Amino acid sequence: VGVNINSTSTLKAKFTNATVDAGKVTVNFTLENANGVAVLGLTKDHDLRFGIAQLTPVKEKVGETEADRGYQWQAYINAKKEPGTVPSGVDNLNPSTQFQANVESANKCDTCLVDHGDGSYSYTYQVNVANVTEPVKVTYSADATQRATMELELPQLAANAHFDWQPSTGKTEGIQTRNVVSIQACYTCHQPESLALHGGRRIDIENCASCHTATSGDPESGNSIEFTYMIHAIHKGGERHTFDATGAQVPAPYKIIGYGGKVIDYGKVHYPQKPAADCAACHVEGAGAPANADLFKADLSNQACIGCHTEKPSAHHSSTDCMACHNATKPYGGTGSAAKRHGDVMKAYNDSLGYKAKFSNIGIKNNALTFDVQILDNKDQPIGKEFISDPSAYTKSSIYFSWGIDKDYPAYTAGSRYSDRGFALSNSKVSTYNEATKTFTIDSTNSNLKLPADLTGMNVELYAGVATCFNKGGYGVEDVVATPCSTDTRYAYIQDQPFRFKWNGTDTNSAAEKRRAIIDTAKCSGCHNKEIVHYDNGVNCQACHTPDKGLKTDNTYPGTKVPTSFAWKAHESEGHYLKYAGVQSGTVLKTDCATCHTADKSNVVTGIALGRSPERAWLYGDIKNNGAVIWVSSDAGACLSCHQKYLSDAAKSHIETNGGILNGTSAADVQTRASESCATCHTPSQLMEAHGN
Numbered sequence: 001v002g003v004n005i006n007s008t009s010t011l012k013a014k015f016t017n018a019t020v021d022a023g024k025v026t027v028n029f030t031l032e033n034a035n036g037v038a039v040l041g042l043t044k045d046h047d048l049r050f051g052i053a054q055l056t057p058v059k060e061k062v063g064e065t066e067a068d069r070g071y072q073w074q075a076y077i078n079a080k081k082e083p084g085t086v087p088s089g090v091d092n093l094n095p096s097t098q099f100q101a102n103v104e105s106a107n108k109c110d111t112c113l114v115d116h117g118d119g120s121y122s123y124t125y126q127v128n129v130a131n132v133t134e135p136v137k138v139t140y141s142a143d144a145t146q147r148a149t150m151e152l153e154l155p156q157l158a159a160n161a162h163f164d165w166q167p168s169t170g171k172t173e174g175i176q177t178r179n180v181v182s183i184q185a186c187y188t189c190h191q192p193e194s195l196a197l198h199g200g201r202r203i204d205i206e207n208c209a210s211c212h213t214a215t216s217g218d219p220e221s222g223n224s225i226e227f228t229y230m231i232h233a234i235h236k237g238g239e240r241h242t243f244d245a246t247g248a249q250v251p252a253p254y255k256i257i258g259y260g261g262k263v264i265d266y267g268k269v270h271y272p273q274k275p276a277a278d279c280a281a282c283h284v285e286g287a288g289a290p291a292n293a294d295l296f297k298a299d300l301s302n303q304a305c306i307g308c309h310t311e312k313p314s315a316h317h318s319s320t321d322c323m324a325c326h327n328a329t330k331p332y333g334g335t336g337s338a339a340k341r342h343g344d345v346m347k348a349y350n351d352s353l354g355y356k357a358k359f360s361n362i363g364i365k366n367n368a369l370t371f372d373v374q375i376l377d378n379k380d381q382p383i384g385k386e387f388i389s390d391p392s393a394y395t396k397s398s399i400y401f402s403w404g405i406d407k408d409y410p411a412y413t414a415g416s417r418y419s420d421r422g423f424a425l426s427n428s429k430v431s432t433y434n435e436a437t438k439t440f441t442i443d444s445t446n447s448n449l450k451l452p453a454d455l456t457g458m459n460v461e462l463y464a465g466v467a468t469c470f471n472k473g474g475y476g477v478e479d480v481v482a483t484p485c486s487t488d489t490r491y492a493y494i495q496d497q498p499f500r501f502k503w504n505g506t507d508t509n510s511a512a513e514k515r516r517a518i519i520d521t522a523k524c525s526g527c528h529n530k531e532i533v534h535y536d537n538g539v540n541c542q543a544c545h546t547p548d549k550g551l552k553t554d555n556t557y558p559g560t561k562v563p564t565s566f567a568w569k570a571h572e573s574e575g576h577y578l579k580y581a582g583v584q585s586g587t588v589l590k591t592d593c594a595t596c597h598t599a600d601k602s603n604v605v606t607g608i609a610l611g612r613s614p615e616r617a618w619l620y621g622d623i624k625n626n627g628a629v630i631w632v633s634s635d636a637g638a639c640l641s642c643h644q645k646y647l648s649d650a651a652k653s654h655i656e657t658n659g660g661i662l663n664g665t666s667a668a669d670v671q672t673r674a675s676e677s678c679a680t681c682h683t684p685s686q687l688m689e690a691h692g693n
């Protein structure tokens, strides 16, 4: 007739209805598995807890007036907490008495929970919601929306459930809500486990909001743990700063002190988004978005701003009433609302999404490469050289010519390096600017380019690693627009696809051969947003960062020599493996190859398919012979982008027994002795399972 709770591998809790009788709350809910079969045997002695809160309209008296704060969750269960253990030698703390909302455990009431034997249950709260005054007062209103929450922790799973309803009417639809964000936006950056918080027993956003209330804080740090403030502060991370009385910028890390005085220092957090002002990463709007998704522009909260900017966001700030000056209805002189000012930041990047390069007159003059190039805005109009950016003296807006782009791009040797195939628009030796057409003419004559003997049949590419200058928002600045580069401007890379074709000697109309699918760049962009690190015209890093690219010195690494390949840069990046980095939440784990690599509709990681480029030879350093230049076969070198440092003898023999090379003197040497059969066993599916997926 049903299935026992202590045996079921899946569980779904659903509230059906709720009732309030003179402060007495009774909720009704059902338990079911994935198939929908009733789950029986839930007792009070299971890790079963319940919360109850009101969505209360809040006004705040700020001086001689009241400001609307919208609706805030107020739990009926709160406790007053004096600070427990506070660690010493830890800065940025201010221990003080704080309130904390809580749930009530069912095991405290012998007659509160009823099993109906059919998969449905009824729970009567131990708290009376009619007159809660201490330690935190909640003025009950039957017209106000109430939220019941339940959390359940079993051996095999943890479950949450919530229920919003209006007591006066019994409506669950068409009532005041505070549905702002969705867990799906969080999952764009977060491993689901990294958001299974506390015991791993708290999963749903609605549960978070029910307990992380505006009146709650951490006693041992003195920090607010209000849902909005906390999440903002956390993600501002190491970029959270403030200004003292002298007007100097000082770090303001958000720290939470917990059990035994342990320190979670969110100053260690590095938010991956560039720029970091795009609210939409969490505040998603559109079809299927939460009802109140536009609350981040309602301008009803100062705490919300303070979460990221603190109370002194500049040397010139003195008042803390953020909404008095930063709003849309009646802004302060010289400034604007958050939406507008944050909008100013985004403007340059949003514009650059419509910026592209137009190539023309491609050919050969005196056995040298030549071509014309224009840089277009989002009106399809050319921009002057004054707007073209040179970010540094070593990083310049340049055009990069590539060949063998369907394989692994040109080899890193004299004449075919990124620096040999690149041409800066500001370098008069190779670049000439026509002012009447706003067009650059490039000639490879005065360079170190070693063009292949015959380009016929080759899949070539012209890549525009180009950025454009824009002004910044600020006092009295109404609009952010393209601005000739200066000491006060900022740059943003243009965003287009590299121009690719098959060389025939006559035209650029013949399509080029496609390279294998390796990574899904939309995944890259999901976490990083507009740009990643440098040369951020899309994700075309593999044009410079080749498998045979020169070794780099890293004194913290065995042999003091590390590769510089694209795969290495991504596989080795600290933020891609947050197990012992950051706050160790495992938010990003490189072990999950589907984080970056291409996967089909059936969730098969096709991007890590082996043996698709047998002719490839990687460049590594021998961790024994002081980072001595060695050469590694195709599939092995892909594995050694993570496995090199702690590599065992048996593992080495495993490579070699199966056709692998780990001691080449050259690439040709490798191709001679290489005969890999790795794709027979190490398949995409078994590689995922081997890494814990």
Ligand code: HEC
Pocket: 100, 101, 102, 103, 195, 196, 197, 198, 202, 203, 204, 205, 207, 208, 209, 210, 211, 212, 217, 218, 219, 220, 225, 256, 257, 258, 259, 264
């Ligand atoms: C009440 C039953 C809560 C629920 C539901 C959620 N949180 Fe929680 N959280 C709660 C308290 C009382 C505290 C203070 C702990 C302290 O040391 O003072 C916290 C703390 C956090 C933190 C800080 C770091 C940490 O404790 O590890 C975070 C990041 C946090 N809470 C997140 C969080 C999330 C995402 C929740 C929904 C899944 C959530 N909390 C629910 C109380 C309660």
Ligand code: HEC
Pocket: 069, 070, 178, 179, 180, 181, 209, 227, 228, 231, 232, 235, 276, 277, 278, 279, 280, 281, 282, 283, 295, 296, 297, 298, 299, 300, 301, 304, 305, 338, 339, 342
């Ligand atoms: C994910 C890391 C977020 C980023 C990026 C931004 N916000 Fe946010 N915001 C986040 C959460 C979890 C919440 C609470 C949702 C809830 O159910 O309560 C919020 C809420 C806000 C609010 C509303 C505050 C209130 O009315 O009480 C505002 C005004 C707000 N956030 C502003 C804001 C802005 C301007 C952002 C871009 C700079 C931004 N947020 C980013 C999580 C995240």
Ligand code: HEC
Pocket: 232, 235, 236, 275, 276, 277, 299, 301, 304, 305, 306, 307, 308, 309, 322, 326, 337, 338, 341, 342, 344, 345, 472, 473, 474
């Ligand atoms: C974290 C998700 C934030 C929230 C919440 C708020 N702001 Fe913000 N702001 C954030 C970033 C990453 C930046 C870019 C500057 C930086 O610190 O890196 C900003 C910037 C501003 C600015 C200046 C705009 C500019 O051109 O630099 C203003 C005036 C501003 N922010 C105001 C503001 C207000 C009023 C907020 C509450 C509604 C608010 N911010 C929240 C990150 C975050």
Ligand code: HEC
Pocket: 302, 305, 306, 309, 310, 311, 312, 313, 314, 317, 319, 320, 321, 322, 323, 324, 325, 326, 332, 333, 334, 335, 336, 341, 473, 474, 475, 476
């Ligand atoms: C009127 C007295 C204001 C109050 C109250 C707050 N802000 Fe402000 N802010 C104000 C002006 C005139 C300016 C300069 C114009 C501009 O848009 O930059 C600012 C600027 C900021 C900034 C950006 C500063 C910088 O990037 O160097 C931020 C991040 C900011 N304001 C945030 C902020 C917060 C969090 C506030 C509440 C504590 C707040 N402002 C109040 C005017 C006024």
Ligand code: HEC
Pocket: 188, 189, 190, 270, 271, 272, 519, 520, 521, 523, 524, 525, 526, 527, 528, 532, 533, 539, 541, 569, 570, 573, 574, 575, 576, 587, 588, 595, 596
């Ligand atoms: C979320 C699961 C991510 C995906 C998908 C990608 N990256 Fe990432 N990356 C992420 C984080 C949290 C960080 C740390 C940010 C920091 O400032 O330290 C990073 C970091 C990088 C870096 C270094 C950035 C820097 O030094 O400024 C690089 C070069 C990088 N990531 C590359 C990269 C590429 C090419 C990706 C697509 C295959 C990609 N990342 C995806 C989180 C996430």
Ligand code: HEC
Pocket: 418, 465, 532, 533, 534, 535, 536, 538, 539, 540, 541, 542, 543, 544, 545, 552, 564, 569
């Ligand atoms: C040629 C114009 C390049 C493009 C396109 C990309 N990178 Fe790069 N990068 C290049 C050089 C010559 C160097 C210095 C030596 C080295 O190989 O390390 C770098 C450096 C990096 C680094 C480390 C240094 C740093 O700034 O953090 C990283 C993490 C890196 N490169 C990653 C990276 C990514 C993600 C790219 C696509 C957006 C990318 N590079 C493109 C040359 C070139």
Ligand code: HEC
Pocket: 181, 182, 183, 185, 186, 187, 188, 189, 190, 194, 195, 231, 234, 235, 264, 268, 269, 270, 271, 272, 273, 281, 282, 526, 527, 578, 581, 582, 583, 584, 585, 586, 587
């Ligand atoms: C990419 C831009 C992210 C988005 C979208 C969200 N989060 Fe995030 N979060 C991100 C990083 C890089 C980190 C640091 C992780 C580390 O281990 O260093 C975090 C951290 C958190 C935490 C703290 C977890 C812990 O202390 O154990 C929480 C509670 C958290 N993030 C919550 C959260 C929510 C609710 C989001 C949706 C509104 C969300 N994050 C989105 C990066 C990103």
Ligand code: HEC
Pocket: 516, 517, 518, 519, 542, 566, 567, 570, 571, 576, 589, 590, 591, 592, 593, 594, 595, 596, 597, 607, 608, 609, 610, 612, 613, 638, 639, 687, 691
């Ligand atoms: C994002 C941080 C990644 C994670 C997570 C994983 N990989 Fe990756 N890998 C990444 C990049 C940017 C590249 C190079 C892309 C390019 O254009 O050259 C790679 C490369 C590989 C390859 C080579 C595939 C081929 O040549 O056809 C393999 C086989 C590979 N990576 C394996 C792999 C595994 C097993 C992972 C889980 C442990 C994994 N990758 C995660 C970026 C990222």
Ligand code: HEC
Pocket: 571, 590, 591, 610, 635, 638, 639, 640, 641, 642, 643, 682, 687, 690, 691, 692
């Ligand atoms: C960085 C993204 C990696 C790439 C590329 C490859 N591997 Fe990996 N692997 C990586 C880590 C951090 C770990 C440890 C896992 C853990 O939970 O601690 C592993 C582990 C394995 C294992 C299992 C080892 C064990 O003792 O059980 C296997 C069998 C394995 N890796 C194989 C493998 C192969 C064949 C790869 C090239 C195709 C490869 N990995 C790439 C990180 C990374």
Ligand code: HEC
Pocket: 635, 636, 639, 643, 647, 648, 651, 654, 655, 658, 659, 660, 676, 677, 678, 679, 680, 681, 682
């Ligand atoms: C079937 C006979 C396989 C062939 C062909 C290849 N691999 Fe393998 N690999 C296989 C198993 C059953 C295991 C785990 C047990 C073991 O004997 O190691 C592995 C392990 C690896 C590892 C992980 C080593 C470690 O984490 O210490 C790596 C890095 C690895 N294998 C690489 C590799 C390469 C490059 C291959 C093609 C030349 C290859 N393997 C083939 C099964 C089989």
Ligand SMILES: [Ca+2]
Pocket: 218, 219, 220, 257, 258, 259
């Ligand atoms: Ca605490």
Ligand SMILES: [Ca+2]
Pocket: 193, 194, 584, 585, 586
């Ligand atoms: Ca965790």
